[PDB]
Amino acid sequence: EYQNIFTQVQVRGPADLGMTEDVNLANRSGVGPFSTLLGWFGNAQLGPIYLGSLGVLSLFSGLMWFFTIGIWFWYQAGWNPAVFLRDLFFFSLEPPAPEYGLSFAAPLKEGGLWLIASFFMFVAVWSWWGRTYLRAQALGMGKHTAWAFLSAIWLWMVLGFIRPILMGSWSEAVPYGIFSHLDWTNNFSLVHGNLHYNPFHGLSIAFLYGSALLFAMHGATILAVSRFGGERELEQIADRGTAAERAALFWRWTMGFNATMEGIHRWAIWMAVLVTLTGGIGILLSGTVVDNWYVWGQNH
């Protein structure tokens, strides 16, 4: 039995330059090379990519963030390349100390540099959000991508900007470091009385686990009916075929109910966005409204 996990025979033709619609073709690059490697698992074509003002701004702004953290790591490493690679995961760019509160007057080496990096990351992420909206608009598509992205932006905004402000101190934000931001995560829970007892944190976990549950279900389902062309989901929505019927009947016979080819993608988008939507709430309430989740939990 062939399982359809990897392509058996790759085929290649003239590159696909894509749909035009109202896309400004001046800002599309040329086509890149084909990747036989990727062709075993998906499409082998690379590019073209669209690159307008927002993309350039996001890209440049994102590299300034990267470079800002970088020079700080080279400074912590005493400019020694050997020390740099040894302690790469231990370096950390920390926010201003509590003393500075919400002031931008922290000297560079005491959180001033963290504030600059956060500015570039802020500009890079939001300009990239505007990018996901206008790319869909230019093709006449719905804005479901930009809205799902807001859910992730929400948690990032709460962690590093909204909550620190409500707490009145930048020191409450997360540091830039591999190991350092893990330690921050562990201390955040210990300080707030065990996040296991933050109900929004438990909800967030149910949706994280549930996203892996649902994508395994959905991926496996579409591959099991790919012998009926089930992956061509848009035309299955406009003209139900035996692929969509067998898929629905498998799950109805298994657990008693089922989705449609379109409806399953609404289950999916909500399962995923609810992860960061509930999580952002749980963090925003920690330290502002609830000091100890375990103790709070025993009264409710």
Binding site: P48, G142, N186, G219, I222, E233, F250, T254
Partner: protein, 281 residues
């Protein structure tokens, strides 16, 4: 009751055991032999949970907790109230999970579809057995397994992790987390992309899959394709669970210290190990 298109698919055949004896439906549910087995194990385990609740002295679901035997029992049997119920419930649970999967296989055969779904479910089963069977046995006591309680089983996660410092530093744990986050990232994008194509701007006709490709090439310069994203989602979710079982089967069996110590082979390479300066100098 049936879906408008369901009847033509309700034919006989496809069973693995019992021929046509259990080849029927109750409402929407297909039974089959393993539908009966599932019901038997599930009904038995739920009785033993209710029985544990009586021994425990509460009927609040938030307080019921069936604990495994104490470590001193090792891998032997324990009395019902002193871990025996946990032992029998673990057998019933395993029976139900495996029966569920073989039922799914019988439903794949009657519908002439692939076996990918029960295959993917078996990874979740493997992870359950990693925590209640493989790791306790390799460690030499059922007590190392987790308790069956809504909140007590979270305490077990916290107690087990902090036994090894910050469990974040478990390197397999990092990988598993990365797949969990990437999976939810990919599920959100996929759901959004289909919906954005089927429900375009007002005053627009339904989009085509070519638009889906174009949207992602415009965004990040590559589109994996309509088949590849379902391959990818299946892979991200199973890999996440695979490395989850892996990150635990090695904890307490071949690794016993704090997981942050594992990262010292990098820091203490005898050449740069002593160079002054940095965080470790």
């Amino acid at each position: 009751a049936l879906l408008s298109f369901e009847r033509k698919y309700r034919v006989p055949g496809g069973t693995l055991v019992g021929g046509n004896l259990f080849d029927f439906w109750v409402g929407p549910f297909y039974v089959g032999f393993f539908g009966v087995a599932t019901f038997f194990f599930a009904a038995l385990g739920i009785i033993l949970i209710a029985w544990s609740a009586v021994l425990q002295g509460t009927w609040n679901p938030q307080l019921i907790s069936v604990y495994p035997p104490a470590l001193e029992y090792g891998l032997g049997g324990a009395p019902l109230a002193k871990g025996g119920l946990w032992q029998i419930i673990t057998i019933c649970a395993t029976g139900a999970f495996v029966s569920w999967a073989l039922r799914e296989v019988e439903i794949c055969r009657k519908l002439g579809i692939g076996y990918h779904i029960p295959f993917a479910f078996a990874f979740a089963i493997l992870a359950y057995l990693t925590l209640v069977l493989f790791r306790p046995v390799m460690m030499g006591a059922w007590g190392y397994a987790f308790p069956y309680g809504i909140w007590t089983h979270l305490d077990w996660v916290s107690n087990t992790g902090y036994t090894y410092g910050n469990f974040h530093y478990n390197p397999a744990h990092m990988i598993a987390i990365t797949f969990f986050f990437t999976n939810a990232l990919a599920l959100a994008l996929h759901g959004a992309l289909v919906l954005s194509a089927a429900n375009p701007e007002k005053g627009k006709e339904m989009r085509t899959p070519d638009h889906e490709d174009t949207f992602f090439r415009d965004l990040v310069g590559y589109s994996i394709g309509t088949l590849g994203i379902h391959r990818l989602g299946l892979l991200l979710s199973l890999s996440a669970v695979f490395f989850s079982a892996l990150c635990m089967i090695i904890t307490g069996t071949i690794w016993f210290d704090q997981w942050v110590d594992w990262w010292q082979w990098w820091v203490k390479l005898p050449w740069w190990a002593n160079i002054p300066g940095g965080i470790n100098g």
